[PDB]
């Protein structure tokens, strides 16, 4: 009774990391075999539990959080990490139990002309709480003068684009990431 990760993540486009997607997948076993329909190899690891304990264990709910980030940012998707992805886009709790899956998606998510669709948050007044999502687009006030909704000196639009191109080095190529949380 395998969770159909290969079906739900067979998608033309993934969520941007600031707008990370959550899917609830119910009454299923979370199994790595199905990922190979997604990609020929992947990062797959778990915090607080070994992947082996998932064998034959059906969960009442599996919450799968998905998004695209640079390859060299996959390291920020872990408890206790710091940086603009962990702090301002997608935050795991210090005591997180669950799993992280990532695969290179350069062939789907990069474009010779630049894929501007994938955005990330670069500026925020405070860090996200664990599993918080911020999709606001207020101008970020970096000084004491009000921005009045216009970017400019000390006034930043808060998101930036990854502009993925297939000739980027692997570290700046897009990776599809899926984070699993479990409810027995």
């Amino acid at each position: 009774n395998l969770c159909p990760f290969d079906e739900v993540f067979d998608a033309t486009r993934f969520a941007s990391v600031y707008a990370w997607n959550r899917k609830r997948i119910s009454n299923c076993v979370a199994d790595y075999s199905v990922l190979y329909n997604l990609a020929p190899f992947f990062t797959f690891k778990c915090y607080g539990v070994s992947p082996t304990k998932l064998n034959d264990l059906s969960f009442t709910n599996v919450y799968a959080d998905s998004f695209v980030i640079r390859g060299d940012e996959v390291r920020q998707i872990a408890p206790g990490q710091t940086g603009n992805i962990a702090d301002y886009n997608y935050k795991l709790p210090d005591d997180f139990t669950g799993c992280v899956i990532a695969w290179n998606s350069n062939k789907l998510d990069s474009k010779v002309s630049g894929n501007y669709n994938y955005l990330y948050r670069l500026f925020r007044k405070s860090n996200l709480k664990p599993f918080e999502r911020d999709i606001s687009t207020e101008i970020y006030q970096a000084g004491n003068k009000p921005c009045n909704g216009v970017a400019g000196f000390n006034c930043y639009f808060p998101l930036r684009s990854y502009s993925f191109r297939p000739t980027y080095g692997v570290g700046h190529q897009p990776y599809r990431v899926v984070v699993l949380s479990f409810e027995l």
Partner: nanobody
Amino acid sequence: QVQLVESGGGLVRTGGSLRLSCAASGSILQIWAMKWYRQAPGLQREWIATIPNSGEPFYASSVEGRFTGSRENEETVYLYLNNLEPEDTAVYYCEVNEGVPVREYWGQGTQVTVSS
């Protein structure tokens, strides 16, 4: 209500020059990039330049060195066409990538005709 309008196409002699322009309007939150494409008679649409809002322009090898992109402000870019050849005859199209979430916007294009 984001829209764009392309202008500056025309008829020129071989070796001639034009300045294409693409101007975005409407309720704009953030422009990410403008892209130029062209479609020649009987051929597939061809990407030729990207003029990002952040970052320097980059180009297809078919035009690089000869066509120059310029960002004049967040809403307005030019594509300077120099050293024009008959095989540059095409309809030229601007695509704007704008907004959160990112959306793509197109126009009707501008005709360039290069006579020999």
